[PDB]
Each structure stands twice: as structure tokens, then as C-alpha cells.
Design a protein around this ligand. Structure first.
Ligand SMILES: NC[C@H](N)c1ccc2c(c1)OCCO2
Lengths: 237, 300
């Protein structure tokens, strides 16, 4: 069924599973027209498909040309997402195909179910976790590849860098969701935290800085403080 | 006009014949139903006074044989049987009529209700949904499951309605996923009408039969089928105009006949609100929308 805090260790068992987040597929800026009306301009988006055990991120870049001359784009975006996830599964060797796909938004259930009718043994599930994957475009190297794309493209990343050589998947996912939640809540302050110290850099082949184990503890504490600080500012606490 | 005689009435029972019903007391001198209109299928149905569990009954057409009812004290029910001795049968009916031991099918001359509910229902199609090939009449009861219900348990006692499933490969062309899920015209017109039913008359016959089994027996799987067949049409952008007009007439008479106090259990709020107010055909069911709003405004 649905996925929540009771069965959270299930994410890190040995059954292949993918999260799918569609919140950055259809991205628009709203602006005023010369006649004083309002118009949207689309910008490139992406599907965020993540294996939470391994860190493998299948980032399908959605180029604005896919919306040309289409209507009801917010609806189409869900079906385009389902089409692309189905295509990804079919491209994977059988032993790499997921046994479950967990969608972050329940509106993705029917589109994905219909596209995956040929895979009756892949479970399509919602989750009751509120996951901050919309903030993926706050990761500079992900945002850069999406905005520079001139055509549809799939790019593969490991969103955990090399952390799984020093920590468990459970801990890596918890670190990722804390980082993304902080970037979602206050992007400027989170990036300041991550880059404040010039002597710690991001390797060419990584997304995040090369923190030692002790520095990650400090960083994680500063991210928790940011989230709590912002909660106090929001609710006047 | 034809006659279904009863050997006797040994247990107190409410007897239905089509949309009519009457009570018979234990061992009362009741010997059947006369003046049954030729030209329509009919259903004779039963609910025991001492055990309202199991409504059950028999679909039949008096043009296909001489049928009668006899109580079986071992299986505990009124059974329909066919009498092959025509002269014996006529002699029995004539005697019971002479002694005025039969009730008259109480049809008002002005009243087209039964025709309107069974316009497309034929015995041959009933006998393909209800499989018991040795009888010319068909038994249905409140508990019988449908083939689709048995996929999600005795196959010989099942209602073989046409399976409709909106999230199935039959309903959804590879490569037309969004199109076919949001607009069911492919599934309605190519798969169901052209492919399975052959024409809209057979589709409407099964829809009408499902409704009547839902209403007369409280058969839950029949109610599911009735609503699925409505939703398939309403959720299709492309439907032959004659079908939309005729569906409106069909549903009007069904809603008109439904017992008011059974509406909570025989009508699916989601399906009706979607069909009347959100679907492609939301503006094509004027008569049905009018009676629904005046008779069941709560459901909406
Ligand atoms: N590949 C096994 C897993 N990523 C793991 C679990 C716990 C660890 C660890 C690695 O590094 C050593 C200390 O803690």
C-alpha cells in the first residue's frame, strides 16, 4: 500500500525500488503581456527518479520543446512523467528493474499504473513521507545540466557521492533529505552553510563538498538549526 | 396472455412478478399468475417470510415453453419447471382459472414501464450470462457472484457479465495511454461495441439486465456492472447520437422505477455525480438528470 514511518527501513532492504518525483517536470514563469494580460513561459524541467538504497539518480531532462502546441500541460506533465519512467524501466536489464515504484504525489498513481500495465508485478505505491525532492534543482550541478540542455536527455548521477564508503544507506538517505529540506526552506542560507569554508571543495565528480565525518556532523547540526530557525520565523515561535 | 401456475404455496412468501409483488400466506390456496403479457421477458421472484436471506427468482419467456412453480421441501425453495405435456398443462391452467385461484398480472393499459425496462433484454442473451443450458429459464439470486468478482467461487453459479476494467490492457492501447484513459471511446466503440457486443442493442440489453438483477435481488455484482456500463458511455467523448438519446431514456425509466428506500444501496454517488456533472456526456442526459435531481437530490 502506501509508504510511511512504520515501514521506513523497507527503503533500504534488497528489493530494488525507485522514488519518482514529478514536481520539477513542468516549470513556468508567469509574467505580464503587452496588453496587460498574463502569460506563462516554460523553462526546462526534469524527472527525479532515485534509488534510495544505492543513490543512483536517473535525471530525465524535460526540454521545453515537449510542451509546444500542447494543451492542459499540468495534466500532460504527469502522463509524460509516467511515459518516461516506463521507458526507463523497459531500458533496464530485467535484474535491474524495480519491484516497486514509489510516487511522491498521489496524482502520479493512475498515469504510472496505466503506463506500467505490461509490468503487473511492479507495485506502484504512494508514500505518506513528505520528501523534499522538489529542491533537487537547488543542487548547482543538477540545475546546470537541466538549464543548459537543448534537447531531451537522460543524465545519471549518484546523489550520495561516495558516502556509502563511510555510512549506511539509511544514514545517507537521512543526510540527503536533511540537506534537501534545508535547501527547500532557505536555499541561500543552506548553500552558505555548505560552501562557507573555502578549504572544503566539491570534487569534479561529486555534487556535495568533501566533508570529513566530523565535518558532516557539524554541517548536519547547522542544517537542523537552519530548519528550526526558519520554523520559528514562519510561525512566530 | 400466458400463465405460470403454482402447484401450491406451502411456505409464506412475498412473490414478485416483474415490478409487481404480493404476499402469500403459509398454505393459502394460491395457484399462480395469469394474463402475463406475451412479447417480453419476465422475472418471477421470491423472498421467504421466515428467512429474508436469499432473494431468488427466474427469468423466462412464455413463448419458449410452458413453465410452472413447485416448492421443493428438500432444497427449501420455489423452483421453476417446464411442463412438456401441453394438454396436461392447459387442463391444469383451465381448472385453476375456473376456480379463480390465480392472481392477474396487474398491468394498467397506459403503463409501458416493463417494456421500457426490458426493451433490449432477450432470453437468449440472458442464457449466455446465466449458464444452465438444460433449462429454458434462468435462475438468479442475491448472492451470485460475477466472473469479474471471481477473478478478484463456483464457476457454474456465476453471472457471466462482460468484464469492464478501465485499467486493463484491453481498455488501453499501447502508445495511447493518456488518450485512452481520459477518453474511453476506443474501449467503448472498437473493443466493446464492434468487438464484443456487435451492436448497441446487445450492450443495452446487458445493462438493463444488470440493473434489474441489482434491483430485484439486491445483487451487488449486478449493480457494479450496471454502473460500469453507464460510466463507459459517459466517459467517452465519441458516442453515436442515437445511443446517447436512448441511454437517457433507459436510465430515466430505471431511476423512475427504483424503490425510493433502496437508493442508498443501489446508487453509486461517485459514478452518478461524475456522469451527470463532469463527464463528456454531462449535457446529454437531460431526462435522467431531471429525474435524479428531483427524486434523489441528496445523492448529488
Ligand atoms: N556498504 C556498506 C554500508 N554503506 C556501510 C554501512 C555502515 C558503515 C559503512 C558502510 O562504512 C563503515 C562504517 O559504517
Amino acid at each position: 500500500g502506501a509508504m510511511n514511518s512504520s515501514n521506513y527501513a523497507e527503503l533500504f532492504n534488497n528489493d530494488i525500488k525507485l522514488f519518482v518525483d514529478d514536481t520539477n517536470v513542468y516549470r513556468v514563469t508567469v509574467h505580464k503581456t503587452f496588453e496587460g494580460n498574463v502569460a506563462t513561459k516554460a523553462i526546462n524541467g526534469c524527472i527525479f527518479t532515485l534509488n534510495p538504497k544505492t543513490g543512483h539518480l536517473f535525471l530525465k531532462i524535460i526540454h521545453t520543446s515537449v510542451w509546444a502546441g500542447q494543451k492542459r500541460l499540468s495534466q500532460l506533465a504527469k502522463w509524460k512523467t509516467a511515459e518516461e519512467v516506463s521507458a526507463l524501466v523497459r531500458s533496464l536489464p530485467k535484474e535491474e528493474q524495480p519491484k516497486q515504484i514509489i510516487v511522491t504525489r498521489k496524482a502520479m498513481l493512475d498515469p504510472l499504473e496505466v503506463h506500467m500495465l505490461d509490468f503487473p508485478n511492479i507495485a506502484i505505491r504512494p508514500t505518506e513521507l513528505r520528501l523534499p525532492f522538489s529542491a533537487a534543482m537547488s543542487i548547482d550541478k543538477l540545475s546546470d545540466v537541466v538549464m543548459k540542455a537543448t534537447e531531451p536527455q537522460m543524465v545519471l548521477f549518484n546523489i550520495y557521492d561516495d558516502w556509502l564508503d563511510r555510512i549506511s544507506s539509511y544514514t545517507a538517505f537521512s543526510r540527503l533529505t536533511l540537506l534537501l529540506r534545508a535547501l527547500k526552506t532557505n536555499e541561500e542560507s543552506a548553500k552558505m552553510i555548505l560552501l562557507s569554508d573555502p578549504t572544503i571543495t566539491i570534487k569534479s565528480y561529486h555534487l556535495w563538498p568533501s566533508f570529513t565525518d566530523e565535518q558532516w556532523i557539524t554541517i548536519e547540526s547547522q542544517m537542523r538549526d537552519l530548519i528550526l530557525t526558519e520554523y520559528g520565523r514562519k510561525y512566530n515561535v | 396472455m400466458n400463465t405460470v401456475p403454482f402447484t401450491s404455496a406451502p411456505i409464506e412468501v412475498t412473490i414478485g412478478i416483474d415490478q409487481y409483488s404480493f404476499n402469500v400466506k403459509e398454505n393459502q390456496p394460491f395457484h399462480g399468475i395469469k394474463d402475463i403479457p406475451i412479447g417480453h421477458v419476465h422475472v418471477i421472484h421470491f423472498q421467504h417470510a421466515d428467512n429474508s436471506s436469499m432473494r431468488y427468482g427466474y427469468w423466462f419467456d412464455c413463448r419458449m415453453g410452458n413453465f410452472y412453480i413447485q416448492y421443493d421441501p428438500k432444497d427449501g425453495l420455489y423452483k421453476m419447471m417446464e411442463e412438456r405435456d401441453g394438454a396436461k398443462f392447459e387442463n391444469i391452467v383451465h381448472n385453476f382459472k375456473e376456480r379463480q385461484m390465480m392472481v392477474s398480472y396487474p398491468k394498467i393499459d397506459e403503463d409501458d414501464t416493463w417494456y421500457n425496462l426490458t426493451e433490449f433484454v432477450q432470453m437468449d442473451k440472458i442464457r449466455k450470462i446465466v449458464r444452465k443450458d438444460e433449462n429454458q429459464f434462468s435462475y438468479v439470486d442475491s448472492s451470485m457472484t460475477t466472473v469479474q468478482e471471481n477473478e478478484l467461487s463456483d464457476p457454474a453459479h456465476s453471472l457471466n457479465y462482460t468484464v469492464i476494467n478501465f485499467k486493463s490492457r484491453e481498455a488501453i492501447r499501447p502508445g495511447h495511454e493518456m488518450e485512452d484513459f481520459l477518453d474511453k471511446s476506443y474501449y467503448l466503440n472498437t473493443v466493446m461495441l464492434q468487438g464484443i457486443f456487435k451492436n448497441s442493442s446487445n450492450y443495452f440489453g446487458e445493462l438493463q439486465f444488470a440493473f434489474l438483477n441489482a434491483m430485484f435481488f439486491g445483487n451487488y455484482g449486478s449493480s457494479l456492472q450496471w454502473h460500469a456500463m453507464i460510466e463507459l458511455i459517459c466517459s467517452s467523448a465519441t458516442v453515436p447520437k442515437h445511443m446517447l438519446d436512448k441511454l437517457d431514456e433507459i436510465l430515466y425509466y430505471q431511476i423512475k422505477t427504483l424503490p425510493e428506500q433502496y437508493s442508498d444501496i443501489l446508487l453509486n454517488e461517485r459514478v452518478w455525480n461524475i456522469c451527470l456533472y463532469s463527464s463528456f456526456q454531462k449535457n446529454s442526459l437531460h431526462n435522467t438528470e431531471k429525474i435524479m435531481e428531483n427524486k434523489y437530490p441528496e445523492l448529488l
